[PDB]
Amino acid sequence: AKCEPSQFQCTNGRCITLLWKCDGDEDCVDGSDEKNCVKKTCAESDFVCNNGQCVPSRWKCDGDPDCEDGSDESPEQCHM
Amino acid sequence: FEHATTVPNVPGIPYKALVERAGYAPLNLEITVVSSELTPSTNKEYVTCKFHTVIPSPQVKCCGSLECKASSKADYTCRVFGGVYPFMWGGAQCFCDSENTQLSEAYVEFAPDCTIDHAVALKVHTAALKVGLRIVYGNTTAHLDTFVNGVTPGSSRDLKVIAGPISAAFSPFDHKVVIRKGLVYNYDFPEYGAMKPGAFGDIQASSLDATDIVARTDIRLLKPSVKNIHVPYTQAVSGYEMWKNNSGRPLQETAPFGCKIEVEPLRASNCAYGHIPISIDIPDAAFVRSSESPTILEVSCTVADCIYSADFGGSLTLQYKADREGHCPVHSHSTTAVLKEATTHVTATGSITLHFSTSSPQANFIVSLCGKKTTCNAECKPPADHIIGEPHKVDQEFQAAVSKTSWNWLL
Amino acid sequence: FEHATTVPNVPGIPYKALVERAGYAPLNLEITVVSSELTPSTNKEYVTCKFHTVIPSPQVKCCGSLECKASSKADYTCRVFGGVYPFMWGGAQCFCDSENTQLSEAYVEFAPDCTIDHAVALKVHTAALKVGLRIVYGNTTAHLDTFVNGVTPGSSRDLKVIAGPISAAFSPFDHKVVIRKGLVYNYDFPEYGAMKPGAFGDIQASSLDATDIVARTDIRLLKPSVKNIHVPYTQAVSGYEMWKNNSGRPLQETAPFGCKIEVEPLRASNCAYGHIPISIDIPDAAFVRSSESPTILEVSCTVADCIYSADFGGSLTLQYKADREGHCPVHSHSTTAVLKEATTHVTATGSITLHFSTSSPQANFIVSLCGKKTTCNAECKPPADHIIGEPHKVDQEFQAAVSKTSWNWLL
Amino acid sequence: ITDDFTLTSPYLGFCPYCRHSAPCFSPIKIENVWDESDDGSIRIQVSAQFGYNQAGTADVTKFRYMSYDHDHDIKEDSMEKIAISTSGPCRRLGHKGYFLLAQCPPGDSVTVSITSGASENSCTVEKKIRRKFVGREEYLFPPVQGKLVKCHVYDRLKETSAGYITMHRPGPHAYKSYLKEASGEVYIKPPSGKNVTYECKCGDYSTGIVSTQTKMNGCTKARQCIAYKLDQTKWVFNSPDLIRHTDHSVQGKLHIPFRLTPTVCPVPLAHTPTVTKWFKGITLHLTATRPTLLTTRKLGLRADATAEWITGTTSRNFSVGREGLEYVWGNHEPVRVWAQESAPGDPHGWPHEIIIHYYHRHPVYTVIV
Amino acid sequence: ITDDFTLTSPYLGFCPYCRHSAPCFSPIKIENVWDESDDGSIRIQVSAQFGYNQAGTADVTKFRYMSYDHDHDIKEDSMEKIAISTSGPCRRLGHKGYFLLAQCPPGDSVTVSITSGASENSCTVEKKIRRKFVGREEYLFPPVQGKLVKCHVYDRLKETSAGYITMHRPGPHAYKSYLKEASGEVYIKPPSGKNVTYECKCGDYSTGIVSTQTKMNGCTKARQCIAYKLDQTKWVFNSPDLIRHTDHSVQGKLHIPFRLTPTVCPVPLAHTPTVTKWFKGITLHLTATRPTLLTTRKLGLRADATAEWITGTTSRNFSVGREGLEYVWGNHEPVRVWAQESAPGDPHGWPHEIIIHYYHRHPVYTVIV
Ligand SMILES: [Ca+2]
Ligand SMILES: [Ca+2]
């Protein structure tokens, strides 16, 4: 793509604005604008696993593992 | 008894006239106009204020398409766009990529604050007239208020009066008039149906609370390109505000002849132009015959110090001797000299004084005390005070506005 | 087979032509200019930006003889004083009263953030002109770009196009041109080494990061007379910023002939002026014998009502009685009526519709279908709307611009 | 036309200029700003209700607003945390429903803000505000004594009404946080004890209502399809920042408070001019410190009126004929002045200076004769 | 270059203003202010290092202070106290070392002050900063949707070097509190545990390093002696209000943060003008609520272009010929218009309507022929 040098290129052939790069929202189907940047942080109301994957605070101890291991369901935080 | 004369149409300034018959003592007759309004017949066609564009929340159909059909509300401009991916606070509002379409529309209606700040565009013509005038006959004051056409009568205690047409007929309003907030302008507004953006008459409506208004303000919906969902649009400036900033002075402080304008029926009251002819009928209850009138003979007058101005500045002394004693009217016949007094008591060998005002340098006017005429003349100097707040009671007439010495020199 | 031709230098619109040999079927030929950029030969000599006066700490010598050297910094300016008494927060910065001296020091340098708005001074001369042609012939399309100098041929895989010298010669760029932030101005900066305080070129530098910065901005030091310690100075206003205030319109909005000026090679791309005669050489493989293209008889041209305008308004129809199916070229042999299409499918006894764009009130031109020549004449009216967004295809020619009615009326 | 607020709810707008100087979603987006008053009052309309609690029981010291969190509910905040500013701080005169009223000096923007600790934003829109006076004699502060004219000013009581607002059905509001992308297949996880619906084109069209987590057949990407809840029935104004429902019909109306009312108001009177008298003329000696309108007109068939705003201490010359003229200086009543003949030279002079008197009067008609 | 921040120190500067509006010695002396950004940002250099500890171990919420009193040391406070302003309070967007970013409204001066605590200072320096916009279509707030042009905004990250700055070794700083005047003899005394380096003249030049209350050779008045402290070696910026050292060479080099960065930004598009046609001409029914620039130029051998900033709803008559015209309006694309030959009349039919038609075209060729 890259229909002009002031914007960003995706493999779908879509040229999207540079302002849409690394803003936390998947914009083009390839999903390339987020792969090259230093992530800000997890949200104030989000949980950080050991792997760094942000976990919403609502998804904690609801009975289903959601993180990479299951530390959200571990009894050390929300006991059964 | 019928009598006809032409009283000038100037409010507040009276005038004097007498009537004569056979075997009857002449009596005073003064007609003064207190108020005079000029009320035309108008026609309201539409009322306008500044718009208030209402954009309903846009519609999106995911993985599909839709069209829009026209409606009847004012300036309804619709448009559909293809290939949008709307977002709001909770992202991913649509499960489709470059297949969903959104719909945009933006109509126009009246503002919520223009139930007071609106303008009414009238259409006036054939301005009629009516006048209220005081009539005094034989020391019996009467009040009347009649029309001005030579047909419509008016009666109050056996007083029948007919007013003729104006010498010059006019109205201070043009063909098209516009009123906002109690004061009248003079504008050439667009007709009901020819709307131009950015000019007065942008919104038409027969009534302010009407259901079917019409307007056009060249709305143009642009294509959305920002991440979230919002309908963009550009619009022309409101014609009402643009005219309001360029309204000019109102007709209150522009109309000629000193006409002051009321706005509730759109009048034009208390202003002077032309002469109105009159035809007044008098009963016999106020007429005394010669067998009861005092007889006057050997009238003599001298003026002390004459001056010609608008106020009563001239002084007149009337020396006389009569047979009986009573009341006898006095009147000045010339059209350039009027007398302040109306009637004066008469005795055997009295001597009364009077007052008068003139517009000519020569005070050569003939008076008549109960019909005994006499000449009376002297020179009048110009006044030093040349600015006053009282209109002239008499008009300027040629063959008298030039001094008699000048007549002798040029003849 | 060479074919010398003159092509008007107007980008976007084609210009048709017909090439015919002896015993060969005629071949169509059109030449369209799609991009025409002229690039002057630039020569940077210095750059400049807003300066930043830096004043080092004032050296003090407490009743000692003191003089300064001469350095190689930009606009160095010394001055040694006498009889001072500096006061910092702890007062009495020396013990020696009224005999101690300090030297001031003040040199200028480049601003920290002038690496983004620095202005480059250029010298431009002898602008060539590079043209990208697009020629088609016999269903074969070629895309080649050539120089317009009279010698060097820019040749494609098969073609050989010697583009001759261009008739007119001009250059929108003056001898001196300045560049900043992608906008091309037109100024006359002072030469390297001769500055003027308060004008463009107040500070000079070969490279932006070069240390041999030479400047002249008359910064003058004053004698301190303050109880505390600080070195006063009075410096002239920056020349670059004051020029920036009243630079004027750039050359992107003033250049004649409609050139839009790009800044990276300092181009003047895509404008129209003059003529660029060429010399094409079609390979013989694209031709064909005259015994293969169809032959026709009974060809008559009928002209429907037209309006002479930039767009293809004029219509045309033909009649014929051919003998073999095939494709035949069509062309008009006039210099003021360009046709629309070149190739057509000729059936046995059908009819072909054409289009043209005439600039004359009467279209008495010759139409050649597959070689046979026929002429048709007609009268048609001027166009209705008098503003169009498409450039004219042919010229007034000042010869057929008058009608035959006027011709025979005057003659 | 209803008045209960237990059947409505606020919403989230998209303010063009948030607190951090960038457009962002905000719960106090202001829609319209009316400035047709005479004291300078303003009727700001925002997207948050004032004067009601979470159930809408008309508590004067509490205002509602939509939350930011994903299991979104309406929350509370004290009323004394609302501030309005245009160029300096405004002062609050009233509030009811979406609307509020204020009065503050002319500026170039209209900003409302929550000055709390947890919820803190400041929406801002562009609006041109200029100080407005009534009648002539431009003034800054109304005087203590002056003539009374007709003013039209908003009344401070909330129990008035001038307008017609319309609430509609609340549109769907999908959230990206419901979805899961665990390994290869998408999971839709409803919140704690709430019902959501999914509507999506994962291969083909499929729609269902779930309360527990489920995996979706034939899915590979979390962006393929969305989910939203169905516990929204309270009405929402048709702001252009929402999504209309499947029908989007008129389903109720609310009052626009703080109606425009006629009310008398004072207005200053200027210094009385000192008139001097000369032949066929008037020389007004005007004196003012602020723009005052002086207008004159004749009384004949033509009026040739005049209109000028004067500011300094000047003097003007007018010409008055036999029919007279009038002038309305400032807010004073009009006065009429007529002129009479005072041409120099006696009309009965022994020498022949009779002409120079009849030359001022009848200026041209004496030379021909 | 270097970034080891533990061996640098702030300094006291002479400031044109103060809390009491008079030139004072303040530790918040500001040297330069840069406002060369297309966003309204500002970079300020002060004489007090922000975002660092007492030793300088990069504490994000502390700043060195450079206390007033004798035996001067280096202390800190919290960064909650630092607040700057231009005309009203404005926002802090970053801080590192001497430098800190800002976003401030247009005004006429730059104020930086410590709000609360034991010491309140200020430093207002005269600089005319005013609103600037990008491209055409002068606006007040950045719109939501428009044309995306290339801006140049400051990079509010702190680890980006905009330039280069120099450091030197500190000069001698004498004090008045190190001198004694008790009799016809002079004493000098250091603080407890510090070694001062006295040098002065009375009879001849003498120096030395002492540790206790030390006598002199002989002289009456103690105003003719100085005594500074010797054991300070932390670097000080090249400020014009410091006494130079003996050598004063470039010891170290640290960064100037907040590098100017190219990026994109939205600018508004105006309302498209409706075009009215007339014979060899064009009119633009222009409408713009804010100043917008209109540029026109012909396409012949003479261009005679124009440029004006219109601000209302006007109409500008232009003349276009055979070669054509192009006009831009605000941020819109350049649109070209060519005029064709259509004069009133007919070039056929009757002779009397041929002269008229050939007179609008070529108004001099028909006369001579
Ligand atoms: Ca993204
Ligand atoms: Ca979990």
Angle at CA D237, nearest 5°, toward D191 and D210? 20
Resolution in A: 3.6
Closest to D122 in 3D by CA, of D30, D256, D60: D30
Residues A54 and A30 in one domain: no
A40 CA to middle of ligand 2, Å? 23
CATH 2.60.40.2400 occupies which residues in chain E?
Answer: 270-338
- Say yes or no for a CB contact (<8 Å) between D180 and A45: no
Angle at CA B251, nearest 5°, toward B250 and B255? 145
Distance between CA atoms of residues C396 and A77, nearest Å: 90
User: What sign for the dihedral angle of Cα C299, C305, C309, C310?
Assistant: negative
Count of domains forming chain A: 2
A10-33 burial, b for 16+ CB within 10 Å, e for fewer? Answer: beeebebbeebeeeeebbbeeebb
Residues A10 and A29 in one domain: yes
- Which residues in chain A are closer than 8 Å to B97, comparing Cβ atoms? 29
CB within 8 Å of D147: residues ≥ 6 apart: D266, D267, D269, D331
Helix H or strand E encompassing C132:
strand C130-137
Q: How far is CA D257 from CA A42, C407, D45, D59, E280, in A?
A: 44, 80, 10, 17, 56
Written out in words, the top-level CATH class of the domain with range B296-410 is mainly beta
- Which residues in chain E are closer than 8 Å to B222, comparing Cβ atoms? 145, 269
> Domain D13-169+256-264 is of which CATH architecture?
Sandwich (2.60)
Closest to C379 in 3D by CA, of C274, C316, C283, C305: C305
Distance between CA atoms of residues C322 and C324, nearest Å: 6
Chains B and D touch (3+ CB pairs under 8 A): yes
CB within 8 Å of D357: residues ≥ 6 apart: B382, D343, D344, D345, D346, D347
Distance between CA atoms of residues D339 and D329, nearest Å: 19
Q: Which two tokens stand for residue E136?
A: 């055409």
B174-B178-B180-B185 Cα dihedral, nearest 10 degrees: -30
What fold does the segment set E270-338 form as a domain? Immunoglobulin-like (2.60.40)
Q: Residue type for C196, please?
A: K
A13 CA to middle of ligand 1, Å? 16
CA count, 13 A, side-chain hemisphere, C108: 27
Q: Phi and psi dihedrals of C245, rounded to 5?
A: -65, -40
Q: Which two tokens stand for residue D10?
A: 């606020």
Distance between CA atoms of residues C80 and C221, nearest Å: 10
For chain A, list the contacting chains (3+ Cβ pairs, <8 Å): B, D, E
Distance between CA atoms of residues D186 and D182, nearest Å: 7
E131-150 burial, b for 16+ CB within 10 Å, e for fewer? Answer: eebbbbbbbeebbbbbbbee
Q: How far is CA C248 from CA B202, C133, D63, D274, in A?
A: 40, 36, 55, 54
Distance between CA atoms of residues B129 and B152, nearest Å: 12
CB within 8 Å of C99: residues ≥ 6 apart: C63, C83
CB within 8 Å of E369: residues ≥ 6 apart: none
Distance between CA atoms of residues B220 and B78, nearest Å: 9
Q: Tokens 């910026």 — which residue?
A: E237
For the segment(s) C2-38+126-172+255-281, the CATH number from 2.60.98.10, 1.10.760.10, 3.30.56.10, 2.40.70.10 is: 2.60.98.10
Q: Phi and psi dihedrals of B68, rounded to 5?
A: -130, 140
Distance between CA atoms of residues E318 and E285, nearest Å: 12
Q: Residue type for B401, please?
A: A
For chain E, list the contacting chains (3+ Cβ pairs, <8 Å): A, B, C, D
E-strand stretches of C216-334: 220-221, 233-234, 278-281, 296-302, 314-322, 326-332
Three-class secondary structure assignment of D252-272? CEECCCCCEEEEEEEECCCCC
3-state secondary structure of C104: strand
Q: Which two tokens stand for residue D93?
A: 């005169």
Chains A and D touch (3+ CB pairs under 8 A): yes
Q: Tokens 């522009």 — which residue?
A: B254
Distance between CA atoms of residues D206 and D190, nearest Å: 17
Measure the N-to-C terminal CA separation of chain A; round to a whole number of Å. 52
Angle at CA E79, nearest 5°, toward E74 and E80? 140
Count of CB atoms within 10 A of residue C6's CB?
A: 12
Q: Which two tokens stand for residue B331?
A: 């009147």
Closest to D201 in 3D by CA, of C385, C16, B95, B313: B95
**What is the CATH classification number for the domain harbouring A46?**
4.10.400.10
- Give yes or no for a contact between D196 and D212, defined as CB atoms under 8 angstroms apart: no
- A48 CA: distance to closest CA in chain D (Å): 16
A42 CA to middle of ligand 2, Å? 16
Written out in words, the top-level CATH class of the domain with range D270-337 is mainly beta
Three-class secondary structure assignment of C10-65? CCCCEEEEEECCCCECCEEEEEEEEEEECCCECCEEEEECCEEEECCCCEEECCCC
Closest to B79 in 3D by CA, of B234, B275, B208, B193: B234
Q: Which two tokens stand for residue E27?
A: 């530790």
Q: Phi and psi dihedrals of E360, rounded to 5?
A: -65, -50
For the segment(s) D176-231, the CATH number from 3.40.50.2000, 2.60.40.4310, 3.40.50.300, 2.30.110.10 is: 2.60.40.4310
User: What sign for the dihedral angle of Cα B85, B87, B92, B93?
Assistant: negative
Instruction: List the shell of residues around ion ligand 2, using CB closer than 5 Å.
Output: A 59, 66, 72
Q: Tokens 């590192």 — which residue?
A: E96
Distance between CA atoms of residues D208 and D171, nearest Å: 18
Residues A32 and A46 in one domain: no
3-state secondary structure of B404: helix
Distance between CA atoms of residues C138 and C156, nearest Å: 17
Q: How far is CA C105 from CA A76, B55, C75, E242, in A?
A: 69, 66, 10, 13
- E290 CA: distance to closest CA in chain D (Å): 11
For the segment(s) C293-410, the CATH number from 3.40.640.10, 2.40.37.10, 2.60.40.350, 3.40.50.980 is: 2.60.40.350
- Give yes or no for a contact between D165 and D97, defined as CB atoms under 8 angstroms apart: no
Q: Residue type for C147, please?
A: F
For chain B, list the contacting chains (3+ Cβ pairs, <8 Å): A, D, E
CB within 8 Å of D349: residues ≥ 6 apart: none
Closest to B105 in 3D by CA, of B65, B145, B71: B71
* Domain hosting residue A75, numbered range: 41-80
Distance between CA atoms of residues A48 and A40, nearest Å: 13
- Give yes or no for a contact between B3 and B18, defined as CB atoms under 8 angstroms apart: no
Closest to E106 in 3D by CA, of E129, E123, E122: E129
Distance between CA atoms of residues C58 and E288, nearest Å: 55
- Quick one: how far is CA C136 from the chain centroid? 26
Written out in words, the top-level CATH class of the domain with range B2-41+123-175+254-281 is mainly beta
Nearest CA in chain E to B238: E313
Residues A33 and A51 in one domain: no
User: Which residues on neighbouring strands pair with residue B329, listed in sequence order?
Assistant: B343
- Give yes or no for a contact between E129 and E76, defined as CB atoms under 8 angstroms apart: no
Q: Any alpha helices (H) in E192-312, and if so which ranges?
A: none
3-state secondary structure of D180: strand
Instruction: Indicate the pairing of strand B326-332 with strand B306-307.
Output: unpaired
- Say yes or no for a CB contact (<8 Å) between E103 and D21: yes
- Which residues in chain A are closer than 8 Å to E148, comparing Cβ atoms? 6, 17, 19
- Which residues in chain C are closer than 8 Å to E349, comparing Cβ atoms? 405
Instruction: Indicate the pairing of strand D281-285 with strand D274-278.
Output: antiparallel
Distance between CA atoms of residues D295 and D279, nearest Å: 21
Closest to E56 in 3D by CA, of E122, E112, E9, E116: E9
> Where are chain B's structural domains?
2-41+123-175+254-281, 46-121+189-229, 296-410
Q: How many residues does chain E have?
A: 369
- Say yes or no for a CB contact (<8 Å) between E173 and C386: no
Helix H or strand E encompassing E266:
strand E260-267
Distance between CA atoms of residues B328 and B343, nearest Å: 6
Nearest CA in chain A to E266: A19
Distance between CA atoms of residues E311 and C112, nearest Å: 37
DSSP state of B192: T
Measure the N-to-C terminal CA separation of chain C; round to a whole number of Å. 44
Distance between CA atoms of residues B398 and B395, nearest Å: 10
- The DSSP annotation for B5-35 comes to EEEE--TT---EEEE--SSB--EEEEEEEEE
The answer as to CATH 2.60.40.3200 being correct for domain E5-170+252-266 is yes
- Give yes or no for a contact between E12 and E29, defined as CB atoms under 8 angstroms apart: yes
3-state secondary structure of E33: strand
User: What sign for the dihedral angle of Cα C103, C108, C109, C111?
Assistant: positive
Instruction: Indicate the pairing of strand B275-281 with strand B2-8.
Output: antiparallel
Residue D196's Cβ-count burial label (10 Å; 0-12, 13-18, 19+) is buried
A53 CA to middle of ligand 2, Å? 13
CB within 8 Å of C22: residues ≥ 6 apart: none
B225 CA to middle of ligand 1, Å? 15
Q: Is E193 left (phi over 0), alpha (psi -120 to 50) or beta?
A: left
User: What sign for the dihedral angle of Cα B154, B155, B158, B159?
Assistant: negative
Q: Which two tokens stand for residue B208?
A: 């302010």
Q: Find the CB nearest B388 among D242, D295, D340.
A: D340
CATH 2.60.40.2400 occupies which residues in chain D?
Answer: 270-337
Distance between CA atoms of residues D253 and D3, nearest Å: 8
Residue E43's Cβ-count burial label (10 Å; 0-12, 13-18, 19+) is buried
Count of CB atoms within 10 A of residue D231's CB?
A: 9
Q: Any alpha helices (H) in D27-162, and if so which ranges?
A: none
Distance between CA atoms of residues B122 and B176, nearest Å: 6
- Which residues in chain B are closer than 8 Å to A29, comparing Cβ atoms? 97
Closest to C228 in 3D by CA, of E23, E29, E173, E68: E23
- Give yes or no for a contact between C79 and C103, defined as CB atoms under 8 angstroms apart: yes
Residues A10 and A30 in one domain: yes
E-strand stretches of B246-350: 275-281, 296-303, 306-307, 314-322, 326-332, 337-339, 343-346
Distance between CA atoms of residues E311 and E136, nearest Å: 13
Q: Tokens 């004090």 — which residue?
A: E175
Distance between CA atoms of residues D127 and D131, nearest Å: 13
Q: How far is CA C251 from CA B125, C121, C183, in A?
A: 61, 15, 8
- The DSSP annotation for A11-69 comes to TTS-EEEGGGSSSSS--STT--TTSSS------TTEEE-TT--EEEGGGTTSSS--SSS
3-state secondary structure of D124: strand
Helix H or strand E encompassing E226:
strand E225-229
Angle at CA A72, nearest 5°, toward A67 and A78? 170
- Dmax (CA) for chain E in angstroms is 126
Distance between CA atoms of residues C239 and C216, nearest Å: 11
User: Which residues on neighbouring strands pair with residue E153, listed in sequence order?
Assistant: E261
Q: How many residues does chain B have?
A: 411
User: Which residues on neighbouring strands pair with residue B262, listed in sequence order?
Assistant: none
CATH 2.60.40.3200 occupies which residues in chain E?
Answer: 5-170+252-266
